[PDB]
């Protein structure tokens, strides 16, 4: 009866996953993570799905403002530690699935991509940014650590002043927000596409298919 937290739709041979928690800026809870993790395993087995597209229904306001840690805090105050460990096992397991996924995943970072949102894009070779992109890792101010495999990605993908993870440490320890073009130039985004062009891009992604006897992997 209530709107599902994550919506799944077909785009020709592309499968679109849309985060559908606008009031929470698409914050990721255990329910969302579990749904996405299970549906991605099915798409991996399918022979009719060529690629997946992870987007939000709230663009350009936000793509994912981060994992739902406020709920995890209440669990700690209530000693519901089993609930908290379930929230992190689901999220981190989804970040590991995206990183090792054999089919192309294309994330549209059209809006605030902070925290869990970074985990949804940092692990995909096709992480598209826009003028509205706002990449940040504001965990040091909440007392947490850089999670969602950002300690394995940022030290390996940043482009400038990252010979010894210096820039990676700067973003993780200061929580600086990077915006649009700057995220693309730093290596946080693989591509820079105007938000207006995302509709056309999505349609083209659904129409392309592996040629002859080549699999989508």
């Amino acid at each position: 009866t209530d709107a599902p937290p994550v919506l799944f739709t077909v785009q020709d041979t592309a499968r679109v996953i849309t985060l559908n928690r606008p009031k929470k800026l698409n914050a990721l809870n255990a329910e969302m993570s579990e749904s996405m993790f299970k549906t991605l395993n099915e798409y991996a087995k399918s022979d009719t799905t060529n690629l997946v597209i992870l987007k939000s229904s709230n663009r350009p306001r936000s793509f994912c403002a981060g994992g739902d840690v406020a709920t995890v805090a209440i669990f700690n105050f209530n000693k519901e530690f089993a609930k908290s460990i379930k929230f992190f096992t689901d999220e981190y397991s989804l970040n590991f699935q995206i990183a090792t996924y054999l089919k192309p995943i294309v994330t549209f970072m059209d809006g605030i991509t902070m925290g869990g949102g970074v985990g949804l894009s940092i692990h995909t070779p096709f992480r598209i940014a826009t003028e509205n992109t706002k990449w940040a890792m504001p965990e040091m101010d909440i007392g947490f650590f850089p999670d969602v495999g950002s300690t394995f990605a940022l030290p390996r993908i940043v482009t400038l002043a990252n010979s010894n993870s210096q820039m990676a440490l700067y973003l993780c320890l200061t929580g600086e927000v990077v915006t649009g073009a700057d995220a693309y130039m730093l290596g946080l985004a693989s591509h820079y596409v105007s938000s207006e062009n995302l509709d056309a891009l999505q349609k083209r992604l659904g129409e392309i298919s592996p040629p002859f006897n080549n699999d989508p992997q």
């Binding site: 299970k38 549906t39 395993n41 099915e42």
Partner: protein
């Protein structure tokens, strides 16, 4: 003739009991079969849905 009348009555009564047992079995099997059909599988995640609407 006494054996014929008593065997026929027994057969008729035994046939009613067998039908009643058979029908109940079929009914139980149908419920089980239907329950398996209604069981959610992992493949169901790939079927698009608009439950709310």
């Amino acid at each position: 003739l006494i054996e014929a009348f008593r065997k026929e009555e027994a057969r008729l009564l035994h046939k009613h009991e067998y039908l009643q047992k058979r029908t109940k079995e079929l009914e139980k099997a149908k419920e089980l079969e239907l329950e398996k059909l209604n069981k959610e599988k992992s493949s169901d995640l790939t079927i698009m849905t608009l439950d709310k609407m």
